[PDB]
Design a protein around this ligand. Structure first.
Ligand SMILES: [Fe+2]
Length: 806
């Protein structure tokens, strides 16, 4: 006669319980088996919360009893109306006697604020052809509400997913100097689309979106947290708007020296800390996320945490071994390419390299031997940076070269830098090779030469490998998924855990990170040209090239070989990011390969899923629309396509992102190791800075790289980005153990979990293998743990999250 239920919810403040009783909250069950005259599932009576059930977290459970006779058949969904003033976070409904589970995880605002009453489905999984008849209209009804109208300013409670270009970064109403090009919607500046906010145009420019205090994301994209400290995405906003101006004020008032004077001054940051004015300390202390980034004395002194790279040797970062090793085991281990001819060539139109083969020490190999056995590699930033060097060098306190670095794979399997080329624009409106050296002024020039390269690499890492390739590239898929795949859909259930916190971090990023005068523009080399440079690189972005084996082959760091376990042979055998990544990759591929056939028996089934098709069509034609005409997009007409798309998406969102994200502070916490900017070119002979370079190599280095003030800001932001929130959900985990009722998916997913821990043991053995020390640890003695699946919270240099979450 009466079905027992239990509602779990969290009050807003966790992210009096009695106030939830009475006629505060009403649920109505919806039948999956018995329909009305129009074929829509029958709806029960308004049923209110009866009492508190006497779990974890800030969660509360409430009892409820539904009238449900045999005429009403089986419940498969429900309506909920919040009559209270304040929104709550709904976790679940559980119906007793099998038991019926509804995983909701959704904010529920006052009923008046919704156009349609909120609906939640049971945890059963269906492709469109398999939805219970009485749930067909409800399902498609919930999708259309999710897509919205494409108009209006989006409000806090809206759950409306739609696309727009990156036209909200510039702030021309404040200043024409803060105008930025629209990125997206043209061939000049192609770019992935982001989540629409509809704030409308600025006064001076109808193409640019006006500023807002809050950058909207659909409501359930903005996760709250039990612990305020875990809202790491918030830290970027407070950094830019509150902390940064406090730092700058500390420098105006002579309270700390404007520049670092020795390397020790930099080591002091994590040691004794830095002395700052009173009001500067009292500013950062109350900030819930920022306060976790430093230690304090209460009144004057702030200290950063000791970066992993310096934890054993404080100077090992300076070695050529470490410089080279970080290209395959560092923060940015995915840019190095095979070089299959000498000298290296450009794809521009003037630009060929001036490095000579004869000048290189290849450990006794000839150049022909090196090329023959594929032992020559390159970090090539020449073509990427040349088109921008003139403009960049026109900025103030910014000077860079377009750099190439030649690498030789030694017999022992380590990388050896053998040349750096530093090029300036050869258009007469205005180009040297540096060889390695251990001693003399030669060694100092080489060291500065290395610094310029890593300035090149830092920018490319932050903006391309990291920002563009993960955050930016992923958002359109998120949007398309909510727009077109029902919460019921198997592929929605597969992919959406890998979108956790993505649109959220990205919105706060557009607001404070990659905006005009934001963190990146005021700390990194290209300044106002930063974001647009990622647009130039997006022109060459290929979705299928993001698949790891494709990536490795494309870069000539691996060849295709069927005889090998993963079907590719590494040309650099102990390439830690690549060797470890292939395990994770393989681990993800098996899971997708097992999950997909559970729901699609043949190619037709993929072709015939109207949701999947509209999804992939919109993701490509709208979401990555500036590239919609490229021939490499998968057609999504077969089983094999579906598997590939899903696998690639899961790869980018979890492992790819983790490998390029969580080494930011561990390697870059020492600014000399990873400078984010260079301020002057090489000193010419007969100049005062030349003598300084002769007489004080440390000062010469510090005067070249990121200034002390922007270092403080840049050190703070990568520290935020490098931390694991205590409520992260890692690869091989789901936030709820009943994410689907399908026992085959559950079991398959559990096998995925087991394989990941097996792999972790394998990586532990790799790190502990003494013969692999050279690449896995190097002179910094820093075990390559960035692709360990598991981690605890904090700055761990390990752990693979499901999604791009920070
Ligand atoms: Fe990130």
């Amino acid at each position: 006669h009466k079905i027992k239920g239990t509602v779990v919810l969290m009050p807003k403040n966790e992210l009096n319980l009695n106030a939830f009783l009475g006629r505060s909250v009403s649920l109505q069950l919806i039948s999956a088996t018995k329909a009305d005259a129009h074929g829509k599932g029958k709806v029960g009576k308004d049923t209110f919360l009866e009492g508190i059930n006497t779990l974890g977290a800030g969660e509360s459970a409430f009892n409820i009893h539904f009238e449900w006779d045999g005429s009403m058949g089986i419940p498969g969904a429900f309506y909920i109306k919040n009559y209270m003033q304040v929104e709550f976070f709904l976790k679940s409904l559980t119906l007793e006697a099998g038991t019926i589970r509804f995983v909701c995880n959704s904010w529920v605002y006052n009923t008046k604020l919704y156009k349609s009453v909120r609906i939640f489905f049971a945890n059963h999984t269906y492709v469109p052809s398999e939805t219970p008849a009485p749930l067909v209209s409800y399902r498609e009804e919930e999708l259309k509400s999710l897509r919205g109208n494409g108009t209006g300013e989006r409000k806090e409670y809206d759950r409306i997913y739609d696309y727009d270009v990156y036209n909200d970064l510039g702030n021309p109403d404040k200043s024409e100097k803060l105008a930025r090009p629209v990125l997206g919607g043209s061939s000049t500046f192609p770019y992935p689309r982001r989540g629409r906010t509809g704030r409308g145009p600025t006064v001076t420019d109808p193409n640019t979106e006006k500023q807002g205090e809050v950058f909207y994301v659909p409501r359930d994209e903005n996760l709250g947290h039990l612990k305020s400290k875990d809202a790491l995405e918030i830290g970027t906003k407070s950094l830019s708007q509150i902390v940064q101006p406090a730092f700058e004020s500390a420098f105006d008032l002579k309270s700390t020296p404007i520049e670092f004077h020795s390397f020790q001054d930099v080591h002091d940051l994590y040691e004794g800390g830095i002395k700052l004015p009173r009001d500067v300390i009292s500013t950062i202390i109350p900030l819930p996320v920022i306060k976790e980034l430093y230690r304090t004395d209460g009144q004057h002194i702030l200290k950063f945490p000791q970066p992993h790279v310096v934890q054993v040797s404080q100077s090992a970062w300076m070695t050529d071994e470490e410089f080279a090793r970080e290209m395959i085991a560092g923060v940015n281990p995915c840019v190095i390419r095979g070089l299959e001819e000498f000298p290296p060539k450009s794809n521009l139109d003037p630009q060929s390299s001036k490095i000579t083969a004869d000048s290189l020490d290849l450990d006794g190999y000839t150049m022909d031997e090196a090329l023959g056995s594929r032992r020559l590699f390159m970090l090539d930033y020449h073509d990427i940076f040349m088109p921008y060097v003139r403009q960049i060098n026109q900025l103030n306190s910014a000077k860079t070269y377009a750099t190439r670095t030649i690498l030789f794979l030694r017999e022992d399997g380590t990388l050896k830098p053998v040349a750096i080329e530093l090029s300036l624009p050869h258009s007469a409106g205005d180009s040297q090779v540096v060889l390695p050296a251990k001693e003399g002024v030669e060694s100092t020039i080489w060291l500065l030469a290395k610094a310029y390269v890593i300035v090149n690499d830092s920018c490319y890492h932050q903006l391309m490998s990291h920002w563009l390739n993960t955050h930016a590239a992923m958002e359109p898929f998120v949007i398309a998924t909510h727009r077109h795949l029902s919460v019921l859909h198997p592929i929605y259930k597969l992919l959406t855990p890998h979108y956790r916190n993505n649109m959220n971090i990205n919105a706060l990023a557009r607001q404070s990170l990659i905006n005009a005068n934001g963190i990146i523009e005021t700390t990194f080399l290209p300044s106002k040209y930063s974001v647009e440079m990622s647009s130039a690189v997006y022109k060459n972005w290929v979705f299928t090239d993001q698949a790891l084996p494709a990536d490795l082959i494309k870069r000539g760091v691996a060849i295709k070989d069927p005889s090998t376990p993963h079907g590719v042979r590494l040309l650099i055998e102990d390439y830690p990011y690549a060797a470890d990544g292939l395990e994770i990759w393989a681990a993800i591929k098996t899971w997708v390969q097992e999950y997909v056939p559970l729901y699609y028996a043949r190619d037709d089934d993929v072709k015939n899923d109207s949701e999947l098709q509209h999804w992939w069509k919109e993701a490509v034609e709208k979401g990555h629309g500036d590239l919609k005409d490229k021939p490499w997009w998968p057609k999504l007409q077969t089983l094999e396509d579906l598997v590939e798309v899903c696998l690639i998406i899961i790869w980018i969102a979890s492992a790819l992102h983790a490998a390029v994200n969580f080494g930011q502070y561990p390697y870059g916490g020492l600014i000399m190791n990873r400078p984010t900017a260079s301020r002057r070119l090489l000193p010419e002979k007969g100049t005062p800075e030349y003598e300084e370079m002769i007489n004080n190599h440390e000062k010469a280095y510090l005067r070249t790289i990121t200034s002390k003030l922007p270092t403080l800001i840049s050190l703070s932001v990568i520290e935020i980005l490098s931390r694991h929130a205590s409520d992260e959900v890692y690869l091989g985990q789901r936030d709820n153990p009943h994410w689907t009722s399908d026992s085959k998916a559950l079991q398959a997913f559990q096998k995925f979990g087991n394989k990941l821990k097996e792999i972790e043991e394998k990586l532990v053995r790799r790190n502990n293998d003494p013969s692999l020390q050279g690449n896995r640890l190097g002179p910094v003695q820093l075990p390559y743990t960035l692709l360990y699946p598991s981690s605890e919270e904090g700055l761990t240099f390990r752990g693979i999250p499901n999604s791009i979450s920070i």
